[PDB]
Curated annotation (Swiss-Prot), chain A:
This is Pre-mRNA-splicing factor 8. The chain holds residues 1836 to 2069 of 2413 of the full protein. Functions as a scaffold that mediates the ordered assembly of spliceosomal proteins and snRNAs. Required for association of BRR2 with the spliceosomal U5 snRNP, and the subsequent assembly of the U4/U6-U5 tri-snRNP complex. Functions as a scaffold that positions spliceosomal U2, U5 and U6 snRNAs at splice sites on pre-mRNA substrates, so that splicing can occur. Interacts with both the 5' and the 3' splice site, as well as the branch region. Has a role in branch site-3' splice site selection. Associates with the branch site-3' splice 3'-exon region. Also has a role in cell cycle. Component of the U4/U6-U5 tri-snRNP complex composed of the U4, U6 and U5 snRNAs and at least PRP3, PRP4, PRP6, PRP8, PRP18, PRP31, PRP38, SNU13, SNU23, SNU66, SNU114, SPP381, SMB1, SMD1, SMD2, SMD3, SMX2, SMX3, LSM2, LSM3, LSM4, LSM5, LSM6, LSM7, LSM8, BRR2 and DIB1. Residues 7-237 are annotated as: RNase H homology domain. Present with 468 molecules/cell in log phase SD medium. It comes from Saccharomyces cerevisiae (strain ATCC 204508 / S288c). Signal peptide: none annotated. The MPN (JAB/Mov34) domain has structural similarity with deubiquitinating enzymes, but lacks the residues that would bind the catalytic metal ion. It is found in: Nucleus.
Curated annotation (Swiss-Prot), chain B:
Residues 244-265 are annotated as: Leucine-zipper. This is A1 cistron-splicing factor AAR2. It comes from the Eukaryota. The modification Phosphoserine is found at residue 236. Heterodimer. Interacts with PRP8 (via RNase H homology domain and MPN domain), competing with BRR2 for the same binding site. Component of a U5 snRNP complex that contains at least the U5 snRNA, PRP8, SNU114, AAR2, SMB1, SMD1, SMD2, SMD3, SME1, SMX2 and SMX3, but is not a component of the U4/U6-U5 tri-snRNP complex. Keywords: Cytoplasm, mRNA processing, mRNA splicing, Nucleus, Phosphoprotein. It is found in: Cytoplasm; Nucleus. One of its GO terms (cellular component) is cytoplasm. Its main location: cytoplasm. CDD domains: Aar2_C (cd13778), Aar2_N (cd13777). Phosphorylated on serine and tyrosine residues. Belongs to the AAR2 family. Component of the U5 snRNP complex that is required for spliceosome assembly and for pre-mRNA splicing. Involved in splicing pre-mRNA of the A1 cistron and other genes that are important for cell growth.
Length: 237, 300
């Protein structure tokens, strides 16, 4: 059934599973036409497919050419997501195929179930968790490869950098969800917190800065403060 | 005009014949039903006064043999049987008729209700859904599960309705996932009509039989099948015009006949709202939409 606060540890067991987030697949800017009507212009998007145990991220870049001459694009975006996730599963060796796919949005269930009919033993699950994976495009290196793409492309990352050398996958996921929740709530403030000390850099092969264990505690505290402030503002509480 | 004689009525029972019903008292001198119209299937159905659980009954066609009802005190039900001796049977019926111990099938001349509910229903198709090849008539009851319900446990007592599943490889061509899921025309027209049913008449016959089992026995699996066969047509963008016109007539008479008090359990809100207001065929079922809006506006 649904993945929730109750069954959260299941994310870090030894059963291969992927989160799929389709938020950033179909992206547009809304603008005025010469005649004063409104139109959209698509920009490149991405499917965010993440192994929460290992940090392996399958970033399938969705090039605007996909949408050319298609109707009902927000509907099509879900089916295109399910087509590409199905294609990714088929591309993996059997021993690397997921046992479960957790979709962040309930509207992905039917599209993914129908594309995965050939895999009756892979469970397609919704979640009650309100995960901040929409903010993936606030990670500068992910945003940069998506915008630069001139054709459909799959790019592989580890979203945890080298963190699993020092921390468990539970702690790594918690740090990732905190960073993304801060980036989602106040991007400018979160990015200021992450880059404020010029001496801490991002390795060429990494997404996030090279914080010591003590610096990560300071950073995580700054992200928590950012999130609660913004919350008091949002709700006047 | 054919007759189904009864040996006796030893237990108090409500007896149904098609859309009609009669209360019979324990040991009331009741000996059957005469003047049954030839040319249609019929159903004779029972609900005991002491156990209003298990409605049960028999589908039959008097053209196929001489049938009678006899109570079995061991199995505790009214059973249909075939009399193979024509002269014994004619003599039984003639005697009971002379003593006027038979009710008359109470058909109004103007009234095409039964024809309209059974237009495509054939005994030979019923006998493939309800498998008991040694009898020419078919037993159905409230509790019998469908092959589809069983997949998801006694195979010999199942309703072998055609399995319809919108999220199945049968329903979805590899490479046409979105197209086939959002527009079920290939599943309706190639897989079901051309492939399995062979023609719209056999499809409608099964749809009408499922409805009648839902209505007369409260058979839940039958109600599921009736709605699935409606949804498969309404969810297809491409349906022959004769089929849509015929479906509107079929459903109109089904909704007209349904007891007003059973709309809550026998009608699926999602399917009817989707079929009448959202589907490709939202504007193709004028008669059905008008009777549903006047008879069951709460459901909608």
């Amino acid at each position: 059934g649904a993945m929730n606060s109750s069954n959260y540890a299941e994310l870090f067991n030894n059963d291969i599973k992927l989160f799929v987030d389709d938020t950033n697949v179909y992206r547009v800017t809304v603008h005025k036409t010469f005649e004063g009507n409104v139109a959209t212009k698509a920009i490149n998007g991405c499917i965010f497919t993440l192994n929460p145990k290992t940090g392996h991220l399958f970033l399938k870049i969705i090039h605007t050419s996909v949408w050319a001459g298609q109707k009902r694009l927000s509907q099509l975006a879900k089916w295109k997501t399910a087509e590409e996730v199905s294609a990714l599963v088929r591309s993996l060796p059997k021993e690397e195929q997921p046992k479960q796919i957790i979709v962040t949005r309930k509207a992905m269930l039917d599209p993914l179930e129908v594309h995965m009919l050939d895999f009756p033993n892979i469970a397609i699950r919704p979640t009650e968790l309100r995960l901040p994976f929409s903010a993936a495009m606030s990670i500068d290196k992910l945003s940069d490869v998506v915008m630069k793409a001139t054709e459909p492309q799959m790019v592989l990352f580890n979203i945890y950098d080298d963190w699993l050398d020092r921390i468990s996958s539970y702690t790594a996921f918690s740090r990732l969800t905190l960073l993304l929740r801060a980036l989602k709530t106040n991007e400018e403030s979160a990015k200021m917190i992450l880059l404020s000390d010029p001496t801490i850099t991002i390795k060429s092969y990494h997404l996030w800065p090279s914080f010591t264990d003590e610096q990560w505690i300071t950073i995580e505290s700054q992200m928590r403060d950012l999130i609660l402030t913004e919350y008091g503002r949002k709700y006047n509480v | 005009m054919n007759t189904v004689p009864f040996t006796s009525a030893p237990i108090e029972v409500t007896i149904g014949i098609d859309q009609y019903s009669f209360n019979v008292k324990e040991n009331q001198p009741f000996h059957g039903i005469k003047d049954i119209p030839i040319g249609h299937v019929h159903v004779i159905h029972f609900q005991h006064a002491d156990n209003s659980s298990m409605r049960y009954g028999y589908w039959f066609d008097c053209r196929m043999g001489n049938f009678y009802i006899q109570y079995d005190p061991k199995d505790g039900l009214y059973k249909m049987m075939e009399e193979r001796d024509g002269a014994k049977f004619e003599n039984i019926v003639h005697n009971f008729k002379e003593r006027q111990m038979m009710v008359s099938y109470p058909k109004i001349d103007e009234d095409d209700t039964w024809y309209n509910l059974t237009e495509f229903v054939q005994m030979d198709k019923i006998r493939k859904i309800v498998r008991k090849d040694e009898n020419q008539f078919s037993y159905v009851d409230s509790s019998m599960t469908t092959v589809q319900e069983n997949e998801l446990s006694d195979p010999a007592h199942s309703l072998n309705y055609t399995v319809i599943n919108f999220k199945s490889r049968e329903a979805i061509r590899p490479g046409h996932e979105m197209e086939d899921f959002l527009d079920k025309s290939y599943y309706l027209n190639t897989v079901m009509l051309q492939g399995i049913f062979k023609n719209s008449s056999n499809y409608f016959g099964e749809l009408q039989f499922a409805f009648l089992n839902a209505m007369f026995f409260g058979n839940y699996g039958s109600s599921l099948q009736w709605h699935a066969m409606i949804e498969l047509i309404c969810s297809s963008a491409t349906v022959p015009k004769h089929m849509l016109d015929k479906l509107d007539e079929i459903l109109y008479y089904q909704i007209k006949t349904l007891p007003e008090q059973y709309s809550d359990i026998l009608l699926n809100e999602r399917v009817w709202n989707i079929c009448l207001y959202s589907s490709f065929q939202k504007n193709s079922l004028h008669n059905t939409e008008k009777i549903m809006e006047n008879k069951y506006p709460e459901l909608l």
